Design a protein around this nucleic acid. Sequence first.
RNA 1: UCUGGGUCGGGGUUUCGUACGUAGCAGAGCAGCUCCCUCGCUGCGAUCUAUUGAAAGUCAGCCCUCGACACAAGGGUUUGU
RNA 2: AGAUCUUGGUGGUAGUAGCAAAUAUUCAAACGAGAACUUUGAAGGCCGAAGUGGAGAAGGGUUCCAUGUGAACAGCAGUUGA
Lengths: 63, 50, 31, 62, 50, 107
Amino acid sequence: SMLRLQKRLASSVLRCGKKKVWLDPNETNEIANANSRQQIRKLIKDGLIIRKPVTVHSRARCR
Amino acid sequence: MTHIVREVDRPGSKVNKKEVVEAVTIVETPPMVVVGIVGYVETPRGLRTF
Amino acid sequence: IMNQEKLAKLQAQVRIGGKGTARRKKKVVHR
Amino acid sequence: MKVELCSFSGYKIYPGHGRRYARTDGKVFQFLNAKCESAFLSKRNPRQINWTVLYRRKHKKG
Amino acid sequence: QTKRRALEKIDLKFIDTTSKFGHGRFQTMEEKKAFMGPLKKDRIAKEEGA
Amino acid sequence: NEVVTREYTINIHKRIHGVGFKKRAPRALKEIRKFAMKEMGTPDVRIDTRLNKAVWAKGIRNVPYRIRVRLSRKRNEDEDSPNKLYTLVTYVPVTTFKNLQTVNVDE
RNA sequence: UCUGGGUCGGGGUUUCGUACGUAGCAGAGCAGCUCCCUCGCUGCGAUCUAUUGAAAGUCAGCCCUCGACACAAGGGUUUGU
RNA sequence: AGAUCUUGGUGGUAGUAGCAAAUAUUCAAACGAGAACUUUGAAGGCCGAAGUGGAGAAGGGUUCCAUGUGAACAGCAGUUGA
Ligand SMILES: [Mg+2]
Ligand SMILES: [Mg+2]
Ligand SMILES: [Mg+2]
Ligand SMILES: [Mg+2]
Ligand SMILES: [Mg+2]
Ligand SMILES: [Mg+2]
Ligand SMILES: [Mg+2]
Ligand SMILES: [Mg+2]
Ligand SMILES: [Mg+2]
Ligand SMILES: [Mg+2]
Ligand SMILES: [Mg+2]
Ligand SMILES: [Mg+2]
Ligand SMILES: [Mg+2]
């Protein structure tokens, strides 16, 4: 269905922007059950929600 | 189209007995094949296919 | 154990994006 | 059939092709195209242009 | 056809046949081969097939 | 046979020539889907995302001149669909496009 | 059809101008290695040289293939003195 | 029958003008009767810290957050929504 709430909660729980929020496309239904931040914590612990790394902005060219 | 170089034989002109360039057109003309004949009759209204 | 068939299908799960993207680390379901 | 010319590039210019240039000092040049002409007007040495005949014979290419 | 422009003998001397797909600068294939010499394309072609 | 897959190359540069800058990348895949329909004769076409990356590899307007794809017409007995067959196209990375011919490839 | 049209490929033509890589006792030079050497070796170094008139593109509204590939006697609507 | 009459309704115009200020979208899957517009994932872009960011004052007053619906509204769609 729609994961608008889950993405917002995952961004709030991980204290990162919605840009870096990543979800497992295959396990859509299990994540759709997450109606609380406590359940979000389980999904992160279960790895279904993953914080994407910071996009690379290297300063080697400047150096 | 293309261009050529030829000798000019126009007396009294500045290009007489000289060399000039002239653009020419190449038109392919394979031989025709005749398949029919139509004759026309001269009516007071003009021409019509007899 | 990680045999040829398991390593064949592991490449699908661990890859979540193209070149330059981070690799998937875990996938566990537990009740 | 006419006089057959040579250019900045050293190439052979056929009749009806290119242009002819006459400077103030009296020297007369002919160019196969604009590219050979533009290089000449930019004051560039044809011995440093790889497709110029003068460069090829300078380095004995071929 | 009365005027001297008409009824005037025409003799050809040279015809442009260069590549009109751009600034053509060779009338024939052979002169292009002669002027430019053997290229990399013909060098390998005569070397692979032997 | 009705399940055979094949390898093709597409002159994207030829089929994009004349299209504006901000539409070159979308037109490439529209041509690709049309190209897939023309050969495999199946209106239902699926485009692999890796190939979609390959079209978008050099941005939106400098679309690669040629691409090498692998058409796969597969039996679509998955649900109630008017087409029994669907064409899945995949991107085949190549080092060069010289002397490449359309080859019949096994499954 | 004595096949046809396509899609690639090849070739021709053309545009720009000599590709990456490799090598060079070429390189303003600079830094480490000298029982070493009797003038040397190992790194950095824009550029230059042979490869290399090379590399790339070339009909989508350029040309010729007989090389490869499948496809094409299929679909629908009408038309009578 | 009028009074550029008053009120209410209905035409041609006409399926016409038009839906063009601020660069840009694409592929796959999911839900669904139905997806160019929803959700996720994968790209390519944009705002480029005097922002399309992060919080307020005035003002708005429940628009806030869930769950559900697809009657009307979001000048198209909407499985979405202030
Ligand atoms: Mg022309
Ligand atoms: Mg070609
Ligand atoms: Mg009245
Ligand atoms: Mg009256
Ligand atoms: Mg009135
Ligand atoms: Mg109008
Ligand atoms: Mg209109
Ligand atoms: Mg508009
Ligand atoms: Mg920017
Ligand atoms: Mg702000
Ligand atoms: Mg309704
Ligand atoms: Mg509407
Ligand atoms: Mg709300």
